[PDB]
Design a protein around this ligand. Sequence first.
Ligand SMILES: *[C@H]1O[C@H](CO)[C@@H](O)[C@H](O[C@@H]2O[C@H](CO)[C@@H](O[C@@H]3O[C@H](CO)[C@@H](O)[C@H](O)[C@H]3O)[C@H](O)[C@H]2O)[C@H]1F
Length: 274
Amino acid sequence: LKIGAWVGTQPSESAIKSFQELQGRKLDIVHQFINWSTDFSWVRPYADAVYNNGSILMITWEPWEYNTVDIKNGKADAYITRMAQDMKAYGKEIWLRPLHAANGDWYPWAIGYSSRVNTNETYIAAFRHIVDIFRANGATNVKWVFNVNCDNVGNGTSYLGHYPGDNYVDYTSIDGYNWGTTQSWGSQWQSFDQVFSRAYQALASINKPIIIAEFASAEIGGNKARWITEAYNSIRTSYNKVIAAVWFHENKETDWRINSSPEALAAYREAIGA
Ligand SMILES: *[C@H]1O[C@H](CO)[C@@H](O)[C@H](O[C@@H]2O[C@H](CO)[C@@H](O[C@@H]3O[C@H](CO)[C@@H](O)[C@H](O)[C@H]3O)[C@H](O)[C@H]2O)[C@H]1F
């Protein structure tokens, strides 16, 4: 079980080192989010810091700038091609997670998104197109991460309708959160198992290893410290295809941070292990 995080900001050398110090352990995976108007030259100083630390960089690559119709039709290809050439030249093993949470309704490339422009077909053609361009440019170092949100949210969404095939995927991944009672829509406290079991059952049918790419717990509505202890136990005990757990450390929709309380931090430090 590799331990990773988005550390709440872009992973400069100091942000990586600070989070490592905070959690009392090596970060095996450092997570970054970038959009589709960011070139690799902007990524480079962060990647150099990650690799100099001896970590793997996972990039969630968010095309706010191009929907799946745009992408499948080649309208982003200059930008994709430059990224693939630059990543190949860089040479280091990078985990790339494009077009994530497509079984939700909140990103403009997602199948559930309310413009209705993204379908299983446009999504798969888009994802395959990206991978084809990277392979054409020799970027064998880039490992492809397929993703689902823990719940299917929005019309038309499913765990695998948008799956582009094992020939296009190195890892699958699940994101999900215990929102506790924090959201006025009526969120409730959920254990790790209540959050993740359904998505895991669907992905466990695919012969690829699984990453928990984004997860955290709120403080409100239950005991976050115990939730952390029990979540890592659950991962190790019953989610055996999961090979990495990548916390989402940011005080954002709620205080997802590992140090949202002293008790949560103590639990996290213990749970992640040696
Ligand atoms: C996983 O679920 C999270 C909980 O709901 C949600 O907050 C995450 O949203 C993503 O959050 C990251 C970090 O806040 C954003 O990162 C920003 O990405 C842009 C590139 O698009 C960067 O330029 C910027 O520096 C990053 O902070 C994501 O945009 C956002 O989708 C969700 F992924």
